[PDB]
């Protein structure tokens, strides 16, 4: 497909967001490259604004699924790819368990010939005491899966996963994801049977940036379909 | 809530089971229920949803064997298996959700609670023979 044909080298990605989060506005640009052969990505994103008013590791999944690696025996199910480069919205609700919920809407298309993911974030009813507004997250990430079911009414695909996040007193801090993707263009789409991406994202620091910042090394890949 | 499966053990190929799982507490009706189940060296398979809007769904090889029900008066979720089969043999989990469940079923990982539930049985053992 021409969708994935995009896909076989090495791609430059582009992320952009703007939060607000209980009135806390914030701003981050971020960086870096995707190779789905290796479903590898590593991602630089900066808070532009100064300080990130919520911890890091809460926007991981918010900040391009279409680098993940599909098996060469699960090539049809791949909905992300055959959607570009015109791209898909991918719309979020993350509800954080005992406190505020994250609603999230984002565009991941081609630019040229980068790959880029522009969002808007929207968070409410947290607590200023909680986990999330009072960073009490560890700064680390567990391995997940993320479980995809179609969507042939708006010719694109959901998912459904909920992220734990290690929290600093040794408690873990649940956050529910509710996912949406539909295709931008009108043109044909893969929808794929159920199935999952196996997600391990990995939390850093450039030694020499000042900027309150994350690095992220992930690999997705693809699976459940034998 | 402690969630509490019965109605497995050995069953004979071409017979039938009917699982059932009892939740504690005054709080079932809003809750998404599912079987999950697992056999020695595969992966967990989430088998039947039944969600809190009533959609039912089935892994494909079970569709049309499999019939997940639920009871919000008796707090109970119910997994009829008819014409069982050697593939069908597995430890079966009851899980309760009240988080965003959109009906998956398949495959889920290694382990069943890599799919994420709130609530979770210890599991009954079905061996077909």
């Known amino acids: 497909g021409k969708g994935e044909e995009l896909f076989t080298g090495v791609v430059p990605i582009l992320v952009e967001l703007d939060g607000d989060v209980n009135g806390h506005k914030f701003s981050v640009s971020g960086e870096g490259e995707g190779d789905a052969t290796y479903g590898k990505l590593t991602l630089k994103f900066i808070c532009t604004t100064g300080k990130l008013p919520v911890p890091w590791p809460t926007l991981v999944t918010t900040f391009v699924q279409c680098f993940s690696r599909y098996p060469d025996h699960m090539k049809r199910h791949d909905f992300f790819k055959s959607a570009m480069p015109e791209g898909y919205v991918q719309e979020r609700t993350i509800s954080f368990k005992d406190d505020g919920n994250y609603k999230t809407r984002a565009e991941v298309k081609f630019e040229g010939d980068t790959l880029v993911n522009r969002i808007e974030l929207k968070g409410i009813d947290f607590k200023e005491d909680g986990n999330i507004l009072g960073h009490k997250l560890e700064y680390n990430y567990n391995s997940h899966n993320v479980y995809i079911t179609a969507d042939k009414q708006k010719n694109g695909i959901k998912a459904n996963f909920k992220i734990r996040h290690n929290i600093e007193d040794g408690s873990v801090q649940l956050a529910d994801h509710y996912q949406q993707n539909t295709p931008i263009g009108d043109g044909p789409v893969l929808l794929p049977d159920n199935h999952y991406l196996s997600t391990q994202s990995a939390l850093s620091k450039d030694p020499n940036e000042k900027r309150d910042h994350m690095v992220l090394l992930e690999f997705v890949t693809a699976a459940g379909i034998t | 809530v402690q969630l509490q499966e019965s109605g497995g053990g050995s069953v004979q190929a071409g017979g039938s089971l009917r699982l059932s799982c009892a939740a504690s507490?005054?709080?079932?009706?809003?809750?998404?229920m599912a079987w999950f189940r697992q056999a020695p060296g595969k992966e967990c398979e989430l088998v039947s949803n039944?969600?809190?809007?009533?959609?039912?769904t089935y892994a494909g090889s079970v569709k049309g064997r499999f019939t997940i029900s639920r009871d919000d008066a008796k707090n109970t979720v119910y997994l009829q298996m008819v014409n069982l089969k050697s593939e069908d043999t597995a430890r079966y989990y009851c899980?309760?959700?009240?988080?965003?469940?959109?009906?998956?079923?398949?495959?889920?990982?290694?382990?069943?609670?890599?799919?994420?539930?709130?609530?979770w049985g210890k599991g009954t053992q079905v061996t077909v023979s």
């Open positions: 507490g005054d709080t079932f009706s809003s809750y998404s």
């Open positions: 899980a309760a959700d009240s988080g965003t469940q959109l009906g998956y079923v398949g495959a889920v990982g290694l382990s069943c609670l890599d799919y994420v539930m709130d609530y």
């Open positions: 039944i969600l809190r809007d009533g959609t039912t």
